Design an enzyme around this catalytic site. Structure first.
Site, PDB file in Angstrom:
ATOM      1  CB  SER A 164      -1.022  -0.014   1.178  1.00  0.00           C
ATOM      2  OG  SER A 164      -2.018   0.971   1.046  1.00  0.00           O
ATOM      3  CG  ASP A 168      -6.700  -2.477  -3.583  1.00  0.00           C
ATOM      4  OD1 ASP A 168      -7.372  -1.458  -2.872  1.00  0.00           O
ATOM      5  OD2 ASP A 168      -5.698  -2.873  -3.616  1.00  0.00           O
ATOM      6  CG  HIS A 204      -5.674  -2.299   0.011  1.00  0.00           C
ATOM      7  ND1 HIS A 204      -5.100  -1.993  -0.948  1.00  0.00           N
ATOM      8  CD2 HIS A 204      -5.249  -1.641   1.008  1.00  0.00           C
ATOM      9  CE1 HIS A 204      -3.914  -1.110  -0.633  1.00  0.00           C
ATOM     10  NE2 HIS A 204      -4.127  -0.810   0.666  1.00  0.00           N
TER      11      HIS A 204
HETATM   12  O1  LIG Z   1      -3.960  -4.908   7.856  1.00  0.00           O
HETATM   13  C1  LIG Z   1      -4.854  -4.224   7.537  1.00  0.00           C
HETATM   14  C2  LIG Z   1      -6.205  -4.699   7.459  1.00  0.00           C
HETATM   15  N1  LIG Z   1      -7.486  -4.271   7.015  1.00  0.00           N
HETATM   16  C3  LIG Z   1      -8.480  -5.088   7.026  1.00  0.00           C
HETATM   17  C4  LIG Z   1      -8.305  -6.443   7.696  1.00  0.00           C
HETATM   18  S1  LIG Z   1      -6.469  -6.224   8.001  1.00  0.00           S
HETATM   19  N2  LIG Z   1      -4.555  -2.999   6.942  1.00  0.00           N
HETATM   20  C5  LIG Z   1      -3.297  -2.632   7.195  1.00  0.00           C
HETATM   21  C6  LIG Z   1      -3.032  -1.966   5.861  1.00  0.00           C
HETATM   22  N3  LIG Z   1      -3.652  -0.532   5.721  1.00  0.00           N
HETATM   23  C7  LIG Z   1      -3.419   0.168   4.467  1.00  0.00           C
HETATM   24  C8  LIG Z   1      -2.052   0.507   4.531  1.00  0.00           C
HETATM   25  C9  LIG Z   1      -1.983   2.008   3.824  1.00  0.00           C
HETATM   26  O2  LIG Z   1      -1.071   2.456   3.264  1.00  0.00           O
HETATM   27  N4  LIG Z   1      -3.381   2.286   3.681  1.00  0.00           N
HETATM   28  C10 LIG Z   1      -3.682   3.559   3.050  1.00  0.00           C
HETATM   29  C11 LIG Z   1      -3.130   4.037   1.937  1.00  0.00           C
HETATM   30  C12 LIG Z   1      -3.491   5.043   1.288  1.00  0.00           C
HETATM   31  C13 LIG Z   1      -4.462   5.881   2.127  1.00  0.00           C
HETATM   32  C14 LIG Z   1      -5.029   5.527   3.283  1.00  0.00           C
HETATM   33  C15 LIG Z   1      -6.121   6.242   3.825  1.00  0.00           C
HETATM   34  C16 LIG Z   1      -7.418   6.171   3.523  1.00  0.00           C
HETATM   35  C17 LIG Z   1      -8.186   6.742   4.160  1.00  0.00           C
HETATM   36  C18 LIG Z   1      -8.181   7.566   5.551  1.00  0.00           C
HETATM   37  C19 LIG Z   1      -6.801   7.534   5.877  1.00  0.00           C
HETATM   38  C20 LIG Z   1      -5.750   6.841   5.069  1.00  0.00           C
HETATM   39 CL1  LIG Z   1      -4.278   7.039   5.417  1.00  0.00          CL
HETATM   40  C21 LIG Z   1      -4.472   4.351   3.790  1.00  0.00           C
HETATM   41  C22 LIG Z   1      -4.237   1.465   4.471  1.00  0.00           C
HETATM   42  C23 LIG Z   1      -5.057  -0.960   5.479  1.00  0.00           C
HETATM   43  C24 LIG Z   1      -5.425  -1.932   6.877  1.00  0.00           C
END
Ligand SMILES: O=C(c1nccs1)N1CCN([C@@H]2CC(=O)N(c3cccc(-c4ccccc4Cl)c3)C2)CC1
Ligand SMILES: [Cl-]
EC number: 3.1.1.23
Length: 289
Positions: A116, A233, A263
């Site tokens: 990510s 995703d 994702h």
């Molecule tokens: O392990 C889990 C699990 N989920 C379900 C079951 S397990 N994860 C770990 C990894 N994250 C990823 C890592 C990453 O870079 N993400 C990311 C990337 C770009 C934007 C945003 C964002 C979106 C909205 C608000 C704030 C933000 Cl910052 C988040 C989210 C997801 C949950």
């Protein structure tokens, strides 16, 4: 004494101090003998290095020395939560850690693994040192964001920055749309080291910067890579995985699409996660023989 956000002294924990004087919490998984290679694990926004325990254990079982840190503003590292002065801080700090470990294991190849936002960081780190890294494993890297989400954010950001509207956010991470595995969703949601706050506009602007910089980096990329991407995703649009396959100049590039998967492929339904671990194992094994 300098302490983690959970009040644990850094003197008791593996750590490093970055170029801005901030303590980053570090994690290591070393095999019993001489490692065959080094691999840095790059977590994403809102999470931390401890999410990667089982994948790291698998890689150390292949005789790699696995290492990681919590990016600034994340996990057990210092910094205002989920903000960064400029996205390149993350890249700089990865390179500091990589350089400090490589000099103590001279001659060993070094790989990157990122998910990510951590995958964007891995791309930009390899593009900053072209020809340096032995390979990269990318799990749903941030190359192109969901276009509706990105558009929404840009509109909101203009209202906050340009029309000075106060306290606006496009909302927190919604884990329920990022894995079909409900048990993994529940584990994530109750992890004490994640960030459950709404996205700050300043950080969303740095994520937009990351995507822009990744676009400019793709034609400089020559590093071998494995790219794993789910077709459903909701965050890192699968179009970006196809873009990376097309525009990278790497001679060794492979894409696997997981049909219907969300994702977080390494925390997905067991059939998907088991495949992800198997594919990473074989790809890294073949490139460390
Ligand atoms: O392990 C889990 C699990 N989920 C379900 C079951 S397990 N994860 C770990 C990894 N994250 C990823 C890592 C990453 O870079 N993400 C990311 C990337 C770009 C934007 C945003 C964002 C979106 C909205 C608000 C704030 C933000 Cl910052 C988040 C989210 C997801 C949950
Ligand atoms: Cl950058």
């Amino acid at each position: 004494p300098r302490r983690t956000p959970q009040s644990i002294p850094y003197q008791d924990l593996p750590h490093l101090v970055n170029a801005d004087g901030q303590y980053l919490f570090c994690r290591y998984w070393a095999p019993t003998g001489t490692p065959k290679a080094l691999i840095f694990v790059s977590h994403g926004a809102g999470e931390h290095s401890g999410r990667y325990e089982e994948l790291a254990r698998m890689l150390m079982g292949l005789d790699l020395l696995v290492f990681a840190h919590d990016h600034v503003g994340h996990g057990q590292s210092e910094g205002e939560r989920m903000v960064v002065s400029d996205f390149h801080v993350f890249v700089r700090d990865v390179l500091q850690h990589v350089d400090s470990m490589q000099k103590d294991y001279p001659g060993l190849p070094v790989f990157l693994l990122g998910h990510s936002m951590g995958g964007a960081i891995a791309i930009l780190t390899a593009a900053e040192r072209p020809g340096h890294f032995a390979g990269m494993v990318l799990i749903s890297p941030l190359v192109l964001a969901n276009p509706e989400s990105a558009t929404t954010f840009k509109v909101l950001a203009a209202k906050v920055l340009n029309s000075v509207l106060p306290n606006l956010s496009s909302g927190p991470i919604d884990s329920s749309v990022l894995s079909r595995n409900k048990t993994e969703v529940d584990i994530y949601n109750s992890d004490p080291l994640i960030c459950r706050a709404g996205l700050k506009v300043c950080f969303g602007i740095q994520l937009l910067n990351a995507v822009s910089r990744v676009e400019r980096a793709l034609p400089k990329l020559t590093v071998p890579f494995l790219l794993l991407q789910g077709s459903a995703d909701r965050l890192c649009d699968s179009k970006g995985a196809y873009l990376l396959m097309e525009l990278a100049k790497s001679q060794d590039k492979t894409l696997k699409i997981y049909e219907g998967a969300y994702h977080v492929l390494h925390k997905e339904l067991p059939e998907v996660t088991n495949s992800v671990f198997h594919e990473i194992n074989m790809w890294v094994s073949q490139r460390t023989a």
